[PDB]
Design a protein around this ligand. Sequence first.
Ligand SMILES: *[C@@H]1O[C@H](CO)[C@@H](O[C@@H]2O[C@H](CO)[C@@H](O)[C@H](O)[C@H]2NC(C)=O)[C@H](O)[C@H]1NC(C)=O
Ligand SMILES: NCCc1c[nH]c2ccc(O)cc12
Ligand SMILES: NCCc1c[nH]c2ccc(O)cc12
Ligand SMILES: CCCCCCCCCCCC
Ligand SMILES: CCCCCCCCCCCC
Ligand SMILES: CCCCCCCCCC
Ligand SMILES: CCCCCCCCCC
Ligand SMILES: CCCCCCCCCC
Ligand SMILES: CCCCCCC
Ligand SMILES: CCCCCCC
Ligand SMILES: CCCCC
Ligand SMILES: [Cl-]
Lengths: 118, 110, 539
Amino acid sequence: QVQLQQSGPELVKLGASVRISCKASGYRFSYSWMNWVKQRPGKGLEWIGRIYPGDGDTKYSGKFKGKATLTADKSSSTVYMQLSSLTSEDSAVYFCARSAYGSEGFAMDYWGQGTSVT
Amino acid sequence: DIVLTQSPASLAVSLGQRATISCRASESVDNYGISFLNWFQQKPGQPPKLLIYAASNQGSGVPARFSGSGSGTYFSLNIHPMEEDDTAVYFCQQTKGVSWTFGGGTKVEI
Amino acid sequence: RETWGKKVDFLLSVIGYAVDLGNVWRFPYICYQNGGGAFLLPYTIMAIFGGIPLFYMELALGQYHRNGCISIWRKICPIFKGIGYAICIIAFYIASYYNTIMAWALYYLISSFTDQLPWTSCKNSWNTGNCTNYFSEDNITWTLHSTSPAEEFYTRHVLQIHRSKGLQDLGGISWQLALCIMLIFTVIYFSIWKGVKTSGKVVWVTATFPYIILSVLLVRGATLPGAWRGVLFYLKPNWQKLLETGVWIDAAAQIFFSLGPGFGVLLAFASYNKFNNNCYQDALVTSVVNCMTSFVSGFVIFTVLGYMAEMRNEDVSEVAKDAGPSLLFITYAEAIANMPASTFFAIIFFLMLITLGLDSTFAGLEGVITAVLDEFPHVWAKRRERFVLAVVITCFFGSLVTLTFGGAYVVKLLEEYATGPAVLTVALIEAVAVSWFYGITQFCRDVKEMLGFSPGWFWRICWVAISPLFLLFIICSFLMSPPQLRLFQYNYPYWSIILGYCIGTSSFICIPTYIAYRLIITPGTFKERIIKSITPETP
Ligand SMILES: *[C@@H]1O[C@H](CO)[C@@H](O[C@@H]2O[C@H](CO)[C@@H](O)[C@H](O)[C@H]2NC(C)=O)[C@H](O)[C@H]1NC(C)=O
Ligand SMILES: NCCc1c[nH]c2ccc(O)cc12
Ligand SMILES: NCCc1c[nH]c2ccc(O)cc12
Ligand SMILES: CCCCCCCCCCCC
Ligand SMILES: CCCCCCCCCCCC
Ligand SMILES: CCCCCCCCCC
Ligand SMILES: CCCCCCCCCC
Ligand SMILES: CCCCCCCCCC
Ligand SMILES: CCCCCCC
Ligand SMILES: CCCCCCC
Ligand SMILES: CCCCC
Ligand SMILES: [Cl-]
C-alpha cells in the first residue's frame, strides 16, 4: 500500500506565502513525478506544475511559473510547494498526485485529503 | 499550450443506458504508439481517483463497467452499465510534452 | 626509430584513407558474441592467412589493369564476368542496411543538443519501463528485469521497436528516421557529384580529431571505476570453445568487411590515384593501422562492458544478453554519460562518427559507380548525373524497409546473410581464377615488370594452395553451420533461415548465370568454348 499524506488546513493572508507538504511512501521515491493539481470550489481541476525528485527538472503550467515553486527532498521523502503573492481568489484545494512508472504516465490513485487554505 | 475542450456539458442519469463523454485532442497526436490521455473521476467531496489510463487499459481497482475507445484525436468513454453510484465529474488529461491540463467537466444529473 | 618521420607520415596518410565505421562498430559486438580473448587470436590468424595476400593482389591488379571492378574480367577471364554483378548486388544490400547505422548516429547527434543528456533521464520522457538512473551511486539493488536508461532510450526513441511484435509484424515508417536518411542521401549525392577526391583539404582536417577523441575516450574508460573486469575477459585464452564451435567464420566475415577485399572498394581506388608509388608496403601499413584501430575499439568496448558488469553486479558476458548492432550506442552512451564535459564530448564523438560513416559510404559507392562505366562508356560515363541519382534513388528505395519500427529486426537479418557467405565465395572464385585460369607466373612477371622486385615465397605459395583451400573450408563451415539469430526477447522463426539463404543466393547466382550464358553465344563444341572463354582478350 502507498499512503500519501499531506498537511492540514491553513489561513490565507494577502501578500503572504504558504508551504504545503506531501510525504509519499510505499514505492521508489526518486523515480516518479509528483504532480500538484488545483481544484477550485465548484469549478474543475487545474494543473500548476510537476517536479521530479532528484533536482532533474521543474515544469509549470505557464501561469504558475512565477507564483509557485517546487522543492524536492530525497531525505524525508517530502515535496513542498511554496507559493508567492497569495491573493484572495487563490483559496482552493491543492492535491498531490504521483505519476506512473514511466511509459504510461498516469495518476496511480495516490491522492491526499486536500489542504484547502482558508 | 495544447488546449483540451469537451463537447458534452451535462448528461442524464439513466439505469442501464449508454452515456458517452468525449474530449477532443485535435492539437495532439500519438507519440510512441500509446495514447497520452487519461480519465479521472471526481466525486462530490472526494479527491479525483483514477478511472482509465492510456484510453485503452483499465486502471487498478476499476470495475469493467468503464471502457475507453478511440485513438489519435477523438476519444470516447463507454459507461453502458451505469448505476446510481456513478454520479461524479469525469475529466481528461493529456501528457504529450509539457502541456498537462484538464478539461471543463462533464457531470451527470437527471 | 631510424625512419620514424616517414613511418608517421605514412600512418597519417593511411588513417586518412583506411579507417572506416566497420572496424569500429561491426568488430566489437561480433567479438563479444563469440567471447573476448578467444576471438582475437583467431582474428589475427584469419587476417595473416587470408586477408593480407588478397589485399595485395587486389591492389596490384587495380594498379596494373587500371579498370573497374567488373572490367578486370574483360582482360583476364571473360567467362567470370558475373563477379561484377555479384559485387554490385552485395554493395546494394550493404547500402540498404549500412545507412541505418549512419541514420542512428545522426539522430543521436541531433538529440544530443540539449543541456540535459537524454541518456541520463528516464522520468517519463518518451517510454520507460523498470528504469534505474544510478547503477550504484544511490545504494540501489539491481534486480532482474531491469533495463538501463540508455538502453530504454535506444529502444524507445531512436527506433520504436515496441510497435513491432517481431520480424513478421512490420508497422509504419518513422518520419524522424526518414527525414534523417533523406538529408544523409542528399549530402552523400553532393559529395559524389563528380568523384574527384585524391588530396582533399577536408579529409586531411577530418582525419585528425578522431585520433585524439579515441585517445581521450580510451583514457576515460581506463580511469573508470570498476572497469578492470572487462580487460581480463578480453584477454582470456578460452581454448574450450575454439575446437568445433564455428568461430572462424565470424572472424572471416569481420576481416573481409573491415579490410576491403571482397567488396570492390580496393579495385576502384587502385585503378587511379596511384601508379608505382611505394607498393608492397602501403597495404601492409594500412592493414596494420586497421588492426590497431579495431583492437583499440574492442578494448574500449570491453572495458565499458566490464565497467557496466561491475556496476550491475553481473557477469561480463551477461550484460548484453542478445544485443547485435545495438552494443555500440549503449556502451558508448553510458561511457559518455560519465564525463565532465558530456555535451561537448558527445557532439564531437557523434560528428567524428558521422564523418567516418560518410567517408566509408563514399568508398563503397565508388566501387560501383566507376565500375560500370567501362562496359558502357558512351551512355553512362559522359552523363555522370543520370546514373548517380538513379543509384541513390535505388539504394533509398531498398533502404526503406529497414526504417520500419522493427528496424533492428531487419538490420540483424541483413548482417549475417547479405555479406557472410557471398563475399567469401566471390573472393574464393576471383582468387582461384587469377591463380589457375590466369597463371601465377604471369602475375609474378607482371608485378615484377611493374614494380621492380618479386614478392616473397610466402605470397606465391598462398594464392595457389593456402588461400583457395582455406576459403573453401570457410565456405564449408558456413554451409554446415545453420545460424541462430535472436534479438532482445525475440526468437527468429524457421522461415527466417530460408529468407536469409535466398538473400545470400541472388548475390551469388549471377556468376553461374553468366557462366551458362557465355557457353551459348560462342558456337562450337564445349572444348573450344571453354578454351576461348578461359583465354583472355586482346585490345
Ligand atoms: C518490468 O518488470 C515487470 C515485473 O513484473 C515485467 O512484468 C511482467 O512481469 C511478470 C511477473 O512475473 C512476468 O510474466 C514477466 O516478468 C513480465 N511479463 C512479460 C514480459 O510478458 C515487465 O515486463 C517489465 N517491463 C519491461 C519493459 O521490462
Ligand atoms: N569498409 C567499407 C564498407 C563497404 C563495403 N562496400 C560498401 C558499399 C556501400 C557502403 O555504403 C559501404 C560499403
Ligand atoms: N554469422 C554468419 C552466419 C552464417 C553461418 N553460416 C551461414 C551460411 C549461409 C549464410 O547466408 C549465412 C551463414
Ligand atoms: C535542430 C538542428 C539540427 C542540426 C543538425 C545538424 C546536422 C549536421 C550534420 C553534418 C554532417 C557532416
Ligand atoms: C528532430 C528533427 C528530426 C528531423 C530533422 C530534419 C532536418 C532537415 C532534413 C532535411 C531533409 C531534406
Ligand atoms: C598481420 C600479421 C602478418 C603481417 C605480415 C607478416 C609477413 C610479412 C611478409 C614477410
Ligand atoms: C516480412 C519480411 C520482410 C523481409 C524484407 C527483406 C528486405 C531485404 C532488403 C531488400
Ligand atoms: C507515418 C509515415 C510517415 C512517413 C514519412 C516519410 C515518407 C517517405 C515516402 C517516400
Ligand atoms: C533518374 C531516375 C532514376 C530512377 C531509378 C529508379 C530505380
Ligand atoms: C510487412 C512488410 C511491411 C513492409 C513495409 C515497407 C515500407
Ligand atoms: C543485366 C543483368 C545481367 C545479370 C546476369
Ligand atoms: Cl577489424
